C-alpha cells in the first residue's frame with residue numbers, strides 16, 4: 336500500500352497516512368531539537384531493513400543534501416540503562432537520589 | 440514485472456448529454472470505482488455520437504453533480520449485439536493511469552475490433 | 553539621471569532587474585584581488601576591460 | 603552447443619564470445635521496479651534467465667555492446683511478436699530478432715535483443731541514490747567505462763565527498779549528455795507508441811544507458827490514436843539525478859550543442875515565462891499534470907510545491 340499511495344494515487348489517503356504514522360510512532364519513536372536528535376528504534380526490525388538503521392540515513396543525505404555524513408560522528412548504544420551518549424552536549428548518567436533512580 | 444493494474448472495477452448506468460441538464464433519464468455506460476471516500480465514476484461509453492455533460496447524484500440524493508466528458512473515442516465491439524459501433528468517454532480531470540485501468544480492463548475482459 | 557533614464561526607456565514597460573543597474577550605469581569600478589597570479593589575468597597593464 | 607552462437611549472430615558481427623557457460627543462462631544482480639499483485643518496491647533482485655553474449659571489435663578486444671537473449675514461455679513470444687512488429691518503425695527501439703531453437707527435446711522459444719548496454723538506467727539511478735562507499739562497484743564501472751574519469755582517480759582518498767574534493771561535481775558532469783539523450787529518446791518512444799495505439803507503463807529497468815528500449819511484455823494494444831503512456835514512476839525516480847549530473851546544461855548553448863558559444867541573452871529580459879514552457883513541453887511532454895510557470899496562479903500549496 337505504500338507503493339500504491341506513493342507512485343499510483345494522486346491525492347492524499349488519510350486512512351493509510353494515519354496507519355503509517357501509528358506504525359512509525361510504534362517502531363521509530365523520536366525526540367527532536369533544532370537538528371540534534373535521539374532515536375529509540377526497534378532492533379529486530381532494523382536488522383532486517385524495515386526501519387532505517389544508519390546507512391539509509393547516509394544515502395538519503397548523500398543524494399538529497401549534497402553532503403556526506405561520515406560514520407564517525409554518529410553514536411550507537413546497545414544498552415539502555417545508560418541514556419543517550421550525547422544530546423545537546425550533555426552526557427547522561429543514571430544515579431540514585433532519594434530512594435529511586437533518575438537521569439541527570 | 441510492472442503490471443498495468445490488477446483487480447479493477449466495473450460499470451454503472453447514468454444519464455448524459457451535451458449541454459447543462461440534458462439528462463433525459465439515463466443514457467451512458469458509466470464505469471464505477473467504489474473508493475472508501477465515495478463511489479468514483481471513471482469512464483463513459485455511449486452510442487450517442489457526442490455528449491458533453493453527465494450528472495450522477497451523490498449518496499445523499501439532494502446532491503447531484505454535473506460531469507464533463509471527453510472528445511469522442513470511437514471503436515467497434517463484437518458482442519451478442521453483433522456489430523456495435525460504440526463511443527467511449529472518460530471524465531476530464533482524469534490522469535493517464537485511470538485511462539490505464541479503464542482501457543486495460545476493457546481490452547482484457549471485453550471484446551473489441 | 554542620464555544613463556539610468558536612457559536604459560529604463562528601453563525596457564518593455566520600464567521594469568529591469570536590479571542586478572544590472574550598477575553593471576551599466578556605475579561610473580566607478582572597484583576590483584579586489586587575492587594574489588598576484590590572479591591579478592595577472594584581470595587587471596593587466598594600466599587599462600583593462602570587463 | 604556451438605551452433606547456438608552462430609544462430610544468435612543473425613545478420614551482423616559474428617565477433618561474439620559468450621560470457622556465460624554455453625547454451626545455459628547466467629545469473630546477474632541488477633535493480634528492478636516491480637509491482638504485480640503481491641510485492642512492490644525498488645531494490646536489487648536476482649535475475650536468472652539471461653544468456654548474455656558480448657561483441658568485440660577488431661584486434662579481438664572487448665567493447666561495450668551486448669546481446670541479451672532471453673528464454674520464456676510461448677504466449678509471451680507471440681504477444682511480443684505482435685507488439686514489436688507493430689512498433690518496429692520507431693528509431694528508439696532496440697532491434698529485436700526472434701527465432702525458435704531446440705535445446706534437448708523442447709522447441710523452446712527465444713528472444714534475442716541486440717546491441718544493448720551492460721548497465722540499464724535503473725542500475726545507475728539505484729547505485730547513485732543508495733550510495734555506500736564500502737560497496738560501490740557498479741558506479742565505478744559506469745564512471746570508468748564512459749571515459750568520465752580513469753581508474754587512477756579512484757585512489758585519491760575521499761573521492762566521493764562533496765565537502766572536500768569538490769571536483770566530483772565536474773566528474774559527475776560528464777553524464778549529462780547521456781541522460782539528456784535518453785530523455786529525448788524516451789519522448790520519441792512515447793510519441794511513437796501513442797501513435798501506434800499501445801497502452802502500458804514505462805520503467806527505469808528497461809531503457810539501457812544508450813537510450814534503446816525493449817521488453818514490451820506488459821503492454822496491450824488498442825485502436826490507433828488513443829494510446830497512453832503511464833509515466834509517473836519513470837520521471838518521479840529519475841528526478842533527483844537530473845540536477846546532479848547537470849543534463850540541462852546542453853541547453854545554454856546557441857544550438858543545443860557543446861561546440862558553440864553560450865547564447866547572449868539580452869540583459870533587460872526578465873519575464874522568461876515562455877522558454878520554461880517550451881522546455882517543459884519538449885522534455886516532459888506526457889507528464890500528466892498541469893504546470894503553471896508563474897507560481898502565483900497555483901491553486902493550493904501542493905501545486906505550489908510541485909511547480910517550484
Ligand SMILES: Nc1nc2c(ncn2[C@@H]2O[C@H](COP(=O)(O)OP(=O)(O)NP(=O)(O)O)[C@@H](O)[C@H]2O)c(=O)[nH]1
Pocket residue numbers: 440441630632633649652654668670672718719720721722807808810816817819820
Ligand atoms: N541489456 C542488459 N540487461 C541486463 C544485463 N544484465 C542484466 N540485465 C537485466 O536483465 C533484464 C533484461 O531485460 P528483460 O528481461 O526483457 O526485462 P524484464 O522487465 O525483466 N522483462 P519482463 O517484464 O517480461 O519480466 C533487465 O531487467 C536488465 O536490467 C546486461 O548486461 N544487459
